[PDB]
Amino acid sequence: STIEEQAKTFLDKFNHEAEDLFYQSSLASWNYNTNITEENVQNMNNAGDKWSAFLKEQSTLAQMYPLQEIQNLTVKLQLQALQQNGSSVLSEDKSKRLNTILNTMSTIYSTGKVCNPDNPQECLLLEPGLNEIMANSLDYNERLWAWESWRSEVGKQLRPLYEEYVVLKNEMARANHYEDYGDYWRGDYEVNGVDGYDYSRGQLIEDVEHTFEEIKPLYEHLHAYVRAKLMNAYPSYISPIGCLPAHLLGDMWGRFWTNLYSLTVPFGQKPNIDVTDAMVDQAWDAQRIFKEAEKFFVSVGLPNMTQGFWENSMLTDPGNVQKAVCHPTAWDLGKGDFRILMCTKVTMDDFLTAHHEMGHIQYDMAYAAQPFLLRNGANEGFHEAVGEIMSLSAATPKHLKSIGLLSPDFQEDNETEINFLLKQALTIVGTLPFTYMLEKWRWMVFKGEIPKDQWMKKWWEMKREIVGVVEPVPHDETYCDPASLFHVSNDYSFIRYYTRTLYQFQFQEALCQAAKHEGPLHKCDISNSTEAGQKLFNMLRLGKSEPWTLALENVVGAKNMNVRPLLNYFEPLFTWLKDQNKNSFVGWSTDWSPYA
Amino acid sequence: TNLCPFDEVFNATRFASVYAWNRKRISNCVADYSVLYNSASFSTFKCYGVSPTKLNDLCFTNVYADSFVIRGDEVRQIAPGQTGNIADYNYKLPDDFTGCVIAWNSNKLDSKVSGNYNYLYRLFRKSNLKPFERDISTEIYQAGNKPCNGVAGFNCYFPLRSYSFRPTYGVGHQPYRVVVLSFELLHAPATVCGP
Ligand SMILES: *[C@@H]1O[C@H](CO)[C@@H](O[C@@H]2O[C@H](CO)[C@@H](O)[C@H](O)[C@H]2NC(C)=O)[C@H](O)[C@H]1NC(C)=O
Ligand SMILES: *[C@@H]1O[C@H](CO)[C@@H](O)[C@H](O)[C@H]1NC(C)=O
Ligand SMILES: *[C@@H]1O[C@H](CO)[C@@H](O)[C@H](O)[C@H]1NC(C)=O
Ligand SMILES: *[C@@H]1O[C@H](CO)[C@@H](O)[C@H](O)[C@H]1NC(C)=O
Ligand SMILES: *[C@@H]1O[C@H](CO)[C@@H](O)[C@H](O)[C@H]1NC(C)=O
Ligand SMILES: *[C@@H]1O[C@H](CO)[C@@H](O)[C@H](O)[C@H]1NC(C)=O
Numbered sequence: 001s002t003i004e005e006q007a008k009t010f011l012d013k014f015n016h017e018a019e020d021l022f023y024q025s026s027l028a029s030w031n032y033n034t035n036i037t038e039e040n041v042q043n044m045n046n047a048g049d050k051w052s053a054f055l056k057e058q059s060t061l062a063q064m065y066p067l068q069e070i071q072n073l074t075v076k077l078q079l080q081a082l083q084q085n086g087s088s089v090l091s092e093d094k095s096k097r098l099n100t101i102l103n104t105m106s107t108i109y110s111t112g113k114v115c116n117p118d119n120p121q122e123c124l125l126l127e128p129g130l131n132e133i134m135a136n137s138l139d140y141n142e143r144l145w146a147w148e149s150w151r152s153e154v155g156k157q158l159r160p161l162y163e164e165y166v167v168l169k170n171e172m173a174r175a176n177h178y179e180d181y182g183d184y185w186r187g188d189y190e191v192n193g194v195d196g197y198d199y200s201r202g203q204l205i206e207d208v209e210h211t212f213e214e215i216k217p218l219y220e221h222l223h224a225y226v227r228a229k230l231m232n233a234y235p236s237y238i239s240p241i242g243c244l245p246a247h248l249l250g251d252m253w254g255r256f257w258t259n260l261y262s263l264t265v266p267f268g269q270k271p272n273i274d275v276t277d278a279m280v281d282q283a284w285d286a287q288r289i290f291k292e293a294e295k296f297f298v299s300v301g302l303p304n305m306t307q308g309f310w311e312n313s314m315l316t317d318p319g320n321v322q323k324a325v326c327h328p329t330a331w332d333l334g335k336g337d338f339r340i341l342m343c344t345k346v347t348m349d350d351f352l353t354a355h356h357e358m359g360h361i362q363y364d365m366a367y368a369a370q371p372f373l374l375r376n377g378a379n380e381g382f383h384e385a386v387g388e389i390m391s392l393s394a395a396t397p398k399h400l401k402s403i404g405l406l407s408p409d410f411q412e413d414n415e416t417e418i419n420f421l422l423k424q425a426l427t428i429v430g431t432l433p434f435t436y437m438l439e440k441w442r443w444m445v446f447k448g449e450i451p452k453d454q455w456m457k458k459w460w461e462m463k464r465e466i467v468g469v470v471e472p473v474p475h476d477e478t479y480c481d482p483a484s485l486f487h488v489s490n491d492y493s494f495i496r497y498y499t500r501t502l503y504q505f506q507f508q509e510a511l512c513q514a515a516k517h518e519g520p521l522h523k524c525d526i527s528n529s530t531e532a533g534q535k536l537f538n539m540l541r542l543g544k545s546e547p548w549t550l551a552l553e554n555v556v557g558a559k560n561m562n563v564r565p566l567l568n569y570f571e572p573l574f575t576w577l578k579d580q581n582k583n584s585f586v587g588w589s590t591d592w593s594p595y596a
Numbered sequence: 597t598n599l600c601p602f603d604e605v606f607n608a609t610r611f612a613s614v615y616a617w618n619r620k621r622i623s624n625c626v627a628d629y630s631v632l633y634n635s636a637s638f639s640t641f642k643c644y645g646v647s648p649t650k651l652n653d654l655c656f657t658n659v660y661a662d663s664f665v666i667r668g669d670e671v672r673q674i675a676p677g678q679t680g681n682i683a684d685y686n687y688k689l690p691d692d693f694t695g696c697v698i699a700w701n702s703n704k705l706d707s708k709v710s711g712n713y714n715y716l717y718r719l720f721r722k723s724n725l726k727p728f729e730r731d732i733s734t735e736i737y738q739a740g741n742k743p744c745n746g747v748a749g750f751n752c753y754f755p756l757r758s759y760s761f762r763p764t765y766g767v768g769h770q771p772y773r774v775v776v777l778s779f780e781l782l783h784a785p786a787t788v789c790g791p
Contacts (some may be wrong), residue, residue, distance in 0.1 A: 001739065006739055006740065009720070009753075016719065016757055020760055306767070307767075333764075335765040335766055336765060336766015336769050337764055337766060
């Protein structure tokens with residue numbers, strides 16, 4: 001026998017033996033997350049130890065199967081994932097430093113202490129401290145106290161450690177032969193060995209830059225409108241041809257513009273659609289939310305939930321003495337065990353989150369037939385762009401009438417579409433430049449174009465020209481401002497929040513095209529549509545068996561990421577914004593500074 | 597009026613593994629095909645070449661009952677002209693089979709929270725099985741070019757594996773008990789007819 005059919009025999013044993021140990025880890029984690037107790041921490045640790053040991057042992061043994069003697073793509077894909085060492089290439093001396101560094105960073109981020117000057121009495125930390133302070137307040141000085149308190153302590157205590165965190169993570173990625181740690185991250189999108197569907201690591205950068213060039217007008221108009229409406233909340237301190245100060249953009253870092261809605265309302269005296277009252281007035285329980293989310297997927301094209309999902313899933317908070325960690329999740333334990341852990345009230349946000357979490361489950365059931373190592377989304381953005389277009393169709397003022405919650409005589413005025421479109425633009429269009437800039441900064445730091453002493457200088461120059469945000473008080477080369485964010489201290493990628501945003505609008509316009517929808521895209525509803533569900537399933541069922549380019553083409557008909565559908569969605573708002581900005585300046589001058 | 601031992605077959609306390617399936621010989625008795633068709637407690641009841649009713653009054657020489665336990669998704673492989681692990685390495689049916697296949701769920705009996713490791717099946721074999729053949733050998737499968745010497749290792753595996761049933765599994769992974777009934781028609785008095 002040759003090498004290929006020997007690898008085929010090896011993978012059979014691996015797939016048989018791996019599914020058994022993955023069920024005990026998931027169930028032990030579920031027991032902890034549903035019922036917190038001291039003795040339910042040891043089982044989780046034991047299961048996690050056994051799973052990790054098995055994975056390491058089988059990864060060691062699978063490196064005696066050279067890839068060059070293999071011609072089938074499926075076995076190559078299954079072997080590549082398992083063969084990857086990771087961080088074990090490091091010497092044991094250089095492996096006791098990196099984990100210690102990461103744990104210290106995580107601990108120092110978790111254990112914060114912000115105390116106001118000349119008063120050691122009260123200290124409020126991040127949750128629910130400064131986060132609540134920088135969520136609802138209209139005082140310049142108070143807002144410019146929490147923004148420098150966090151950067152004064154944490155940054156100055158993460159700069160020395162991060163400098164080491166960079167040097168090791170590169171060398172590891174230099175031992176894995178990838179040029180550096182940024183390209184290691186970009187290797188997720190790589191496709192090789194398929195004609196007409198290949199994709200290189202360096203092409204992702206160029207594909208990202210081109211798209212951002214076709215969103216600048218909309219972001220400039222939104223930025224100018226927000227700036228025009230922020231000169232009245234704070235009578236001054238904002239210049240009409242300048243950059244928005246960092247401590248006046250909702251949350252702390254400026255990652256989301258959502259909390260600026262109370263100050264920026266297109267048409268006041270016209271409230272938005274809320275059906276919480278309707279639910280709470282005519283006896284809506286916690287199951288009817290999950291009984292109507294089923295009849296959506298069943299209506300469109302898709303199978304119904306299993307019996308074990310209706311009896312092994314915690315859908316309502318337990319209360320009493322038993323403790324439960326509330327966070328909406330969707331668990332695939334294997335062996336046909338799907339369940340959802342989330343404590344739900346009777347509101348509208350829970351109703352829309354239910355569709356998200358049920359879409360997550362419905363994506364999992366489709367690729368349960370693939371081998372163990374090929375059960376995931378095509379890339380790191382396919383799995384949260386599928387469970388998110390289901391909340392886009394469960395909130396339109398046509399789905400709600402059809403289920404008996406929005407008055408059957410309701411009228412749709414065009415003074416309310418703009419109000420709904422700014423709520424949806426303060427979250428989607430107002431975060432793309434931040435993600436782009438942060439990931440580009442990390443890419444340059446990892447590559448080496450940014451020397452160690454010009455670190456905080458380049459940060460507050462890309463804030464100027466890419467985002468439009470200015471220092472309220474100048475920072476020298478002693479802070480580490482990006483380290484103040486969660487995904488920079490704890491090692492995580494950050495580009496997945498960009499591409500996903502562009503994917504979810506490519507999908508919808510495709511599905512709405514199969515439903516013969518007429519009118520604005522934002523008013524679409526994929527219900528009772530047997531043509532869109534089949535098209536979505538023809539991508540859901542594959543998993544990681546085929547390149548993400550082919551899976552994307554199966555639904556949208558294009559081989560690359562595109563931004564035009566996102567601009568089509570936000571068209572009326574663009575016209576309104578352009579019409580209401582005939583007496584202002586679009587753009588910002590990168591010279592004005594609050595501290596002069 | 598001697599009743600055939602159908603209770604000892606369908607109502608056995610413990611069943612057998614697939615690679616060691618149990619065979620029972622039924623002959624010289626009166627067979628009552630009334631607690632099988634009428635009983636609406638069977639998940640799968642399929643007969644090939646013989647109508648279930650009506651044809652329940654035909655004389656046969658010998659009858660065979662083959663019993664084992666598989667999982668839910670594998671029941672479809674107990675049929676002529678089917679491929680898979682169960683059909684090729686465990687239990688093989690001829691193309692011209694004449695008989696019946698019955699399968700029913702047994703979750704409340706064969707599943708345990710800690711896992712039921714008493715049930716086994718064969719994963720590796722040199723060649724496919726001929727029809728109605730049973731192999732209970734335990735020689736190490738030699739996938740490489742080096743001798744295994746009866747010890748597992750690199751490119752040497754133990755041929756038997758366990759199902760590990762648990763109560764919280766899905767329908768397709770739950771245990772199913774399977775009984776296959778075969779009828780023999782030879783140049784014999786055929787003392788098994790049944791009213
Ligand atoms: C197996 O044992 C049972 C109990 O002794 C027999 O009785 C039948 O049991 C089923 C439920 O398991 C009932 O639905 C039937 O009504 C019972 N029938 C009678 C006559 O009591 C059952 O017949 C036995 N199985 C076989 C194949 O004989
Ligand atoms: C939670 O765990 C404790 C373990 O101390 C156990 O006694 C209790 O029955 C569990 N409760 C539930 C609802 O599982
Ligand atoms: C690759 O291996 C899988 C699994 O055995 C098989 O189904 C597939 O046909 C193989 N590829 C080709 C091109 O034959
Ligand atoms: C799902 O639908 C099937 C028929 O399509 C039905 O047999 C089954 O009971 C349904 N499941 C639930 C939980 O209602
Ligand atoms: C889908 O069909 C149901 C069946 O009653 C109906 O109530 C609902 O309004 C339909 N959806 C749309 C968008 O018309
Ligand atoms: C809403 O429609 C009316 C009627 O065409 C129009 O006069 C008005 O300007 C529209 N509102 C906006 C914000 O475009």
